[PDB]
């Protein structure tokens, strides 16, 4: 338990595949973490998961053997710091549209002098022991979300920020801001082109790029295109679709 | 909202198909209730769902448009009464092995003189209004679980109990008590024979019979065999299987 | 804080008036406890209040200056003991129909040798300090509910049980068991006669008698009749009625 | 369930009357929603109601048949977005003192291009179905609170903001900022004059105006004066007053 | 994680030392589990810890590296089964006074044919994988508490019950039932003699014996006397004592 | 209960000693409040304690007889206001680095005209009664944390802010920002010198100064040096250390 599993993937030359949870609770969190996911992201933006509910989920994901990540409600330093101290080891912050906002994200992820993270690592100290402080930055992964035309306009400046590992595309909001339907795994040409451009710029910068996916097949293609961090697919969406199919099968003549 | 949707299926000559939840929370409960399920059963036996977590789930299922059912942890009258008053409108009680235990279940489901249910129907009174008391028995469905060789031995006496609608087979415990593996949707001959026998005896008694299913295809066959109430399939099992397949698809060459 | 406020009323020659809560939460609990109520009863039978929600409510009632009481879901010794150790100082147990059931209630309320209460008084020890054990019995009030024709039949035997202070009439269930509507504050002659009889028998036995009331005027009359413990009226009922009147006043021409 | 009940009142030429909850929990929320309230506002500013407790309350209000509204703790976009995605369909934001702050509120309530609301409408999509995005703005009501002399000074500029329906007066804070006692339903002339002025300016702008009321009679007068959205009265205040009166009636000679 | 750490101690010829938690929450649970405790017992009898709060604590203890145990509120089969399925791997049941009560405890801990445990091992299946059923009995430790003169009278019959590992002395209740003060780590001769007798009888029966301790020094002596399972000391007691000493040190001249 | 216990210490010429809680829950909160602590600080920054969990803890601390304080996650006005209205009577805000940030803290603590605190004091009104508004400022203590080189640089300007009582040193973050290990109770000369300087400047300004301590002996020395508010020591740290010692004592030969 003495390495961030996602950073280990990267250091060993492979991308990371992560789950995505919008449903609160520990039981499915542990169960999915025990599958061949490198990380499980808990969504605190588009879900009813508040801090009180995320906290035990982090424990359950770690026990199950995946790295606990959180997609926060907002890029707020103190919110992020409190998640880090509760044992979130990856942070995906929404709506990072400028270099300054990316610097605000980075500031929360590193103790002085690299950042201004406040010191009181209740759960990381239990995981990593006495040597935590010297390795703390490496234990956390940080990605800025790219979800607007403004973020696209500022992508090179965002990617130039030290202390974030790279960017995570939110393609539904991106489609909407471009005037298209917010369809997951879209084929809309302007959105597909923007996604490819963000990936190309991130790799030109020597940074990591991730993307939210709605299906296993789309995730496979994103991995083939070279994305470093791919999520697939939300618990609620997979569960709904599975139940709809069970009903169709049960009710068929 | 002025009828129990499962009793309406039966009264209109069709069986009922129900979901099965072992994961706490309201969001997937509502989402699954809005699918073509007549009822959604919340499992309080083989899950971490306690009373505090079941209570909002009942609300969410009703809002979504399925009848809220609970499979209780135990056949205990006061537990059942408190669920009824919180807006559980179907009760499946585990480990009903004798006529006396079936009578104990029935006692909880009916006000005097048919039973001894205590009066204080906080949520049913809001749903049904001033005429609730006169229709209360019809608003609730009750099924005794058949899960042991003892329950099999006593099946005709259990089915003779007034004030339960019938029985619900728990085929994993039944297999185990017969010395076989607790495989859902089993083909083991002795278990399949016992299941068919329970159904035959329930219908000979003019009662309803249900069964827990692990798949849509098995549920379809159970409906074809004449089961009146079929559950398919647990949220956690469907979600796990869906995630495992998404991972396999994403990681494939 | 070194006396049970209800026992102090009795010892000083006056009855006790108590509130009644079916809504979970601490804020209204404290607010009502600060009114001229001697006790506030938290209903864990006909409400969604589970142990996790009752526990902080007990604290809030004590801070507000009323004695915290609980009407339990069932007459179960271990449930009652855990409430006592969480700082419930009055227990009203439903559906006590026989002397044996009354003895079961009494057993939970007293340490050996008078009863079999298990020792680990987390919150009473904080309230009462080192001398708690020697005074423990006096710190708790216990009342058996009388809610059925069977309990009426056995009233003298129930009242003969040492280690309960007396009985608490539940007049809605009593009406129902007699074949009448479960109207609070009923005028139905057979119910009114049964209520008076229970009071007379309790006083002939030198015991205390209480009754659940739905209105202040009915409570006043019950106090005038000599009831020792009167509750009036449920939070939810008072709040509903108040809101209905505010709406009528607001929407009037 | 395919319209916002408050907007329907307005579209049909009538004002809306709403409840106001400072007590957490679902049971009174549903019960009050089933009364003749068009909406029920949950107060997350002057209450102990956090996100974890508001979430089930929204479900309960909708089931009961009133539109779920929230008065937030602060005018924060991401907080508001997460409430919208949990099924809050009306937002009242405190302490909106400038046009810029009003624009910040409006930004959270509309998807691009009218605003920057992030896309992931977990509960609205369940309520409204596939056509949600095209109707999303109409499904939500937004009101900026007017609670300071500064907000009074800027009232015309605040009212000029597209994408909020209007303003909601908080008359206790307004009184305090003017140097008067924070009495609900005040008669203090300067406060009464400021309230009338805000209403007049809102109607001159073709916008809606609301006000918090402490009594049914005051609410009736506010409706007669032409307020479009009137709240009356807080659950805790109504419950306290009702209990105080029950005690007075019970303890009277 | 594929063995019960307490059974491993025993199988390797050493006793087990366990912590004892009366405070709800995961953070101290994990922290104490990471110390040199073989197990951590969560007290659900003399604490405010309900099922909803115990569930995440079990996860946290396992992550920290101690075996999660529960001292239940009561010897109730269905309560115990639900704890087992939530990942409690040791059960200490209070107030086991007869062989029949010991048989009731054993019945809950073993699948058929050795017992009647119901099948649905949500969390054990995640821990132990597909081979769980064949090893399930070995994964769980069960101890009956000896806390009364009656249990002392029946000690040999209790120890003769197959399917419990042995007994756990509760010396405060035992002292009380003998008419002595309920002092932890008592020197009262009759209590000390009864404790020694229970240990001697348990070892004569080839069974395990445990005892609750209030201090490290007493625990050391109990280990030297040959107790197989020693708890020391309750979180709340240790924390209180530590705080009292910090205050005394801070306030000293 | 009609005075802030910490302000009473100061008014009577003595410093205040306070506890420090990072573990959620009411039982240890009450127990520690009943010790000779003037206040108990609940840490909402470096802990998993969210609003839903802090709220009952405030009640428990007040019942136990210490003043409830909160160290917030961030210096945010609306967060602070909601804590005040839930009965936090002392606020310690982290990372106050400039006079403007100190003014933002002060603004939240006082009603107009001294500040802009919003009016709706649910719990203070219950504690203090009708005269609350006129005494509200005195009922609350506010301290700005000094945790960075920037805050050191701006210490005199921070201390010049009306409406905060003074400053609270966070010496672990301060050490880190100076390039030293974040050891509690440090002897590192530059940190010790900075701490003394902050105290000297606070007293030159006629203000109060506090410091977080990790031990009773260090706290004693800080009191001797003239600190006005000393915390010692975190619940989790004291509990861990106590358990480690119990284990060492139990396992010793
Ligand atoms: Br897998
Ligand atoms: Br999706
Ligand atoms: Br469907
Ligand atoms: Br299954
Ligand atoms: Br009063
Ligand atoms: Br009533
Ligand atoms: Br109405
Ligand atoms: Br009001
Ligand atoms: Br250790
Ligand atoms: Br102890
Ligand atoms: Br002390
Ligand atoms: Br420390
Ligand atoms: K994994
Ligand atoms: K449905
Ligand atoms: K009182
Ligand atoms: K309505
Ligand atoms: K360990
Ligand atoms: K104190």
- A215 Cα–ligand 2 center, Å: 7
Q: How far is F59 from chain C (nearest CA, A)?
A: 6
Cβ atoms within 10 Å, residue D2: 10
Are F and B touching by the rule of 3+ CB pairs within 8 Å?
A: no
Residue F131 near residue F139 (C-beta atoms within 8 A):
no
3-state DSSP call for residue B82?
Answer: helix
- A62 Cα–ligand 11 center, Å: 39
Q: Which two tokens stand for residue F195?
A: 């701490």
Q: Which of C131, C126, D78, B47 is nearest to A45 (CA)?
A: D78
Contact E239 F244 (CB under 8 A): no
Name the residues around ion ligand 9, CB cutoff 5 A: E 35-36; F 244, 247
Q: Which of A48, C53, E57 is nearest to F48 (CA)?
A: E57
Residue D4 near residue D127 (C-beta atoms within 8 A):
no
Contact E252 F31 (CB under 8 A): no
Between β-strands D90-93 and A208-212, what pairing exists: parallel, antiparallel or unpaired? Answer: unpaired
Residue numbers in C near D230 (CB within 8 A): 250
- Cβ-based contacts under 8 A for chains A and F: 54
Helix axes D77-85, D51-64, angle to 10 degrees: 40
Chain-centre distance of CA C8, in angstroms? 16
In angstroms, the CA D17 to CA D5 distance is 11
Ligand nearest to the CA of F65: 18
Mutate to test the interface with F, among E21, E54, E250 (most CBs of F within 10 A): E250
- Cβ-in-10-Å burial (0-12, 13-18, 19+) of A221 comes to middle
3-state DSSP call for residue D72?
Answer: coil
In angstroms, the CA D136 to CA E166 distance is 64
Residue numbers in F near E238 (CB within 8 A): 239, 242-243, 246
Q: How far is D128 from chain F (nearest CA, A)?
A: 31
Q: Residues of chain E whose C-beta is under 8 A from some C-beta in F?
A: 17, 19, 22-28, 31-32, 35-37, 47-48, 213, 215-217, 219-220, 223, 230, 232-233, 235-236, 238-252
Distances, alpha carbon D89 to alpha carbons A231, B34, C58, D68, in Å: 30, 20, 35, 6
Residues 6+ apart with CB under 8 A from A250: B17, B213, B216, B217, B219, B220, B223, B230, B232
What is the structure's resolution, reported in angstroms to one decimal?
A: 1.4
Q: How far is C160 from chain D (nearest CA, A)?
A: 30
Beta-bridge partner residues of C229: C16, C210
Q: Which of E81, D88, D56 is nearest to B55 (CA)?
A: D56
Residue numbers in F near D184 (CB within 8 A): none
Domain total of chain A: 1
Q: Which two tokens stand for residue C72?
A: 């339990």
Between β-strands D39-43 and F16-21, what pairing exists: parallel, antiparallel or unpaired? Answer: unpaired
Q: What is the CA radius of gyration of chain A?
A: 18
Q: Which of F246, F214, F235, F216 is nearest to F27 (CA)?
A: F235
> Can you list the positions of beta strands (E) in chain A?
16-21, 39-43, 67-71, 90-93, 141-146, 166-169, 208-212, 229-234
Task: Output the DSSP codes for E183-229.
Answer: -TT---HHHHHHHHHHHHHHHHTT-EEEEE-SSHHHHHHHHHTT-SE
In angstroms, the CA A32 to CA A169 distance is 23
Ligand nearest to the CA of C6: 15
- C34 Cα–ligand 10 center, Å: 35
Cross-chain CB nearest to A85 (options F46, F76, F236) = F46
Distances, alpha carbon D153 to alpha carbons A252, D156, F118, in Å: 66, 8, 18
The helix or strand, by DSSP H or E, that contains position B92, with its residue range, turns out to be strand B90-93
Residue numbers in E near B52 (CB within 8 A): 50, 52
Q: Active-site residue numbers of A? A: 46
Q: Active-site residue numbers of C? A: 46
Q: Which residue of A has its CA nearest to F95?
A: A118
Cross-chain CB nearest to D59 (options B60, B122, B123) = B60
Beta-bridge partner residues of F144: F93, F167
- D241 Cα–ligand 5 center, Å: 9
Method: X-ray
Residue numbers in E near B214 (CB within 8 A): none
In angstroms, the CA C41 to CA C43 distance is 6
Exactly one of D1, D3, D28, D46 is catalytic; name it: D46
Cβ atoms within 10 Å, residue B34: 18
Between β-strands B39-43 and B166-169, what pairing exists: parallel, antiparallel or unpaired? Answer: unpaired
> E109-143: buried (b, 16+ CB within 10 Å) or exposed (e) per residue?
bbbbeebbbbbbbbbbbbbbeeeebeebeebbbbb
Per-residue 3-state assignment (H helix, E strand, C coil) for D151-187: HHHCHHHHHCCCCCCEEEECHHHHHHHCCCCCCCCCC
Residue C4 near residue C140 (C-beta atoms within 8 A):
yes
Residue F67 structural domain: 1-253
Q: Residues of chain D whose C-beta is under 8 A from some C-beta in C?
A: 17, 19, 22-28, 31-32, 35-37, 47-48, 213, 215-217, 219-220, 223, 230, 232-233, 235-236, 238-252
Cross-chain CB nearest to D250 (options C27, C216, C245) = C216
Q: What are phi and psi of F247, to 5 degrees?
A: -60, -45
Chain-centre distance of CA F139, in angstroms? 15
3-state DSSP call for residue F206?
Answer: coil
The helix or strand, by DSSP H or E, that contains position F143, with its residue range, turns out to be strand F141-146
- C212 Cα–ligand 8 center, Å: 29
3-state DSSP call for residue E44?
Answer: coil
Residue numbers in F near D172 (CB within 8 A): 119-120
In angstroms, the CA C232 to CA C166 distance is 19
Is E46 among the residues known to form the active site? yes
Q: Which of F119, F109, F136, F106 is nearest to D94 (CA)?
A: F119
Long-range CB contact pairs, E195-201, < 8 A, 24+:
E195/E169, E195/E171, E196/E225, E197/E152, E197/E155, E198/E146, E198/E152, E198/E155, E198/E167, E198/E169, E199/E169, E199/E225, E199/E226, E199/E227, E201/E155, E201/E156, E201/E159
Cross-chain CB nearest to F112 (options D48, D50, D177) = D177
Residues 6+ apart with CB under 8 A from C193: none
Contact B28 A236 (CB under 8 A): yes
Query: Which position has the token pair 């809102």?
Result: D202
Task: Report the first-to-last Cα separation within chain A, whole angstroms.
Answer: 51
Residue numbers in B near E78 (CB within 8 A): 45, 73-74, 76, 94
């Amino acid at each position: 338990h003495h390495h961030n599993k996602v950073r280990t993937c990267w250091n060993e030359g492979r991308p990371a595949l992560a789950g995505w949870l919008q449903l609160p609770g520990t039981l499915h969190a542990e169960a999915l973490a025990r599958l061949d996911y490198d990380a499980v992201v808990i969504d605190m933006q588009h879900s009813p998961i508040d801090f009180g509910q995320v906290a035990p989920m982090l424990i359950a994901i770690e026990l199950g053997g995946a790295e606990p990540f959180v997609r926060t409600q907002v890029n707020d330093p103190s919110d992020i710091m409190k998640l880090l101290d509760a044992g979130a080891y990856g942070i995906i912050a929404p709506m990072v549209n400028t270099r300054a906002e990316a610097q605000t994200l980075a500031s929360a992820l590193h103790y002085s002098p690299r950042g201004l993270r406040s010191f009181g690592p209740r759960r990381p100290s239990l995981r990593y022991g006495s040597g935590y402080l010297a390795q703390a930055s490496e234990t956390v992964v940080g990605l800025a979300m790219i979800e607007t035309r403004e973020a696209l306009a500022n992508i090179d400046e965002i990617l130039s920020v030290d202390g974030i590992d790279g960017v995570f595309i939110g393609p539904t909001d991106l489609a909407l801001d471009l005037g298209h339907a917010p369809l997951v795994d879209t084929e809309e040409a302007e959105v597909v082109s923007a996604i490819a451009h963000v990936r190309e710029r991130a790799h030109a910068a020597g940074k990591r790029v991730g993307i939210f996916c709605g299906s296993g097949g789309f995730a496979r293609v994103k991995l083939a295109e070279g994305f470093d961090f791919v999520t697939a697919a939300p618990d609620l969406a997979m569960l709904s679709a599975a139940a709809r199919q069970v009903i169709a099968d049960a009710r068929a003549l």
